[PDB]
Design a protein around this ligand. Structure first.
Ligand SMILES: Nc1ncnc2c1ncn2[C@@H]1O[C@H](CO)[C@@H](O)[C@H]1O
Length: 361
């Protein structure tokens, strides 16, 4: 439903027109819309995330509510940089539509907002380091103190604490950030390996595409991607095709020791599991163990313009080592610890927090 500035949300006795009054738009996503609100009870600014009137996003929102209850219980000050959820309710519409609403602390713009406002110019390395350290602290918190995996590490889900922000709208190395959006997170304390399609495309780890089971390590891959983005201001993997995405991965890391896209083990024909179906769809992308690129881009067409554009796009993809200037060699190594095709090779976030890129500063 379309919402305008001035309308209310969450009606109570003292405020029959809504406890939370809309002041400004804050953000949007497939889940719904996040709106800046004035809490008529506490007379403070809050951020109300309203979920779309769909069942799947409602389940996701309830999972986010549960996880954020646990996270606010185990860290109320938010020493580990996770967004504080103040409240949650259900707003009914004039048409009978029920929307889940989560009330969070009011934060500033996203890291994506920062990158856009500066015309996608590369983020300086010291600010990059501050943000990466705090984000890595949050990921360490989740993974190792809660056995929770986020799966949606993206620049849109890292927000600036407004106290660090300034009216000149230029962040410094003292910026404070918070990780948000736990509507896709999963607890791995009982089942640590999953096979469902998760992660935003551009930050999706290869094991998720290939079907060899993902776990905590996938977040690290996303983290790595994000870092490269912050170094260049540009999205690393710009593709929505699985074959092209895996080829871009292979190209970015071709001259990295031991990084080759390998197909999953072929399951039995009498296997109906979600993982086996993903593995079959993934094997459909390979020919004799090699990634069917570029001939697989347009199989039927012998002379295709889409295949030629895919060839050009993969050629434009740089080798990882060539992206970074020499003086930033350390950062390169840090990202090598994250952008590995085998999830078993990626470092733990606690180990990454002890990398020279951080503890030599
Ligand atoms: N607490 C918050 N403060 C400010 N913006 C937020 C908050 N939570 C979510 N958003 C915005 O809504 C979207 C969340 O996916 C992003 O665009 C993000 O900037």
């Amino acid at each position: 439903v379309q919402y305008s500035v001035g309308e209310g949300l969450g009606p109570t006795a003292d405020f029959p027109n809504g406890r939370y009054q809309i002041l400004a738009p804050l953000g949007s996503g497939t889940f719904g819309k996040v709106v800046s609100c004035w809490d008529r009870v506490t007379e403070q600014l809050v951020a109300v995330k309203v979920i779309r009137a769909v069942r799947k996003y409602a389940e996701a929102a309830r999972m986010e509510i549960d996880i954020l209850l646990e996270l606010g219980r185990k860290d109320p000050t938010s020493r580990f940089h996770c967004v504080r959820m103040l409240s949650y309710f259900t707003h009914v519409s004039q048409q009978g539509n029920a929307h889940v609403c989560l009330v969070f602390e009011h934060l500033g713009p996203s890291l994506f907002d920062v990158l856009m406002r500066n015309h996608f110019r590369p983020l300086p390395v010291p600010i990059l380091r501050a943000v990466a350290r705090q984000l890595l602290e949050a990921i360490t918190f989740l993974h190792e103190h809660n056995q929770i995996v986020h799966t949606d590490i993206k620049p849109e889900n890292v927000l600036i604490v407004p106290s660090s922000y300034y009216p000149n709208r230029q962040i410094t190395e003292h910026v404070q950030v918070r990780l948000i959006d736990f509507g896709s997170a999963s607890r791995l304390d009982k089942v640590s390996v999953r096979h469902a399609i998760v992660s935003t495309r551009h930050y999706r780890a290869p094991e998720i595409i290939l079907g060899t089971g993902w776990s905590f390590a996938c977040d690290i891959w996303s983290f790595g991607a994000l870092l490269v983005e912050c170094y260049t201001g540009q999205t690393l993997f710009q593709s929505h095709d699985d074959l092209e995405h895996l080829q871009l991965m292979q190209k970015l890391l071709q001259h990295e020791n031991g990084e080759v896209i390998v197909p999953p083990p072929r399951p039995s024909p009498s296997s109906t599991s979600m993982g086996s179906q993903r593995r079959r769809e993934a094997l459909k992308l390979f020919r004799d163990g090699r990634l069917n690129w570029p001939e697989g881009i347009d199989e039927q067409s012998a002379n295709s313009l889409a295949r030629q554009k895919s060839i050009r796009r993969v050629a434009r993809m740089p080798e990882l080592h060539s992206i970074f200037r020499p003086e930033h060699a350390c950062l390169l190594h840090l990202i090598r610890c994250c952008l590995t095709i085998d999830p078993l090779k990626r470092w733990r976030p606690s180990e990454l927090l002890r990398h020279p890129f951080f503890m030599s500063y």
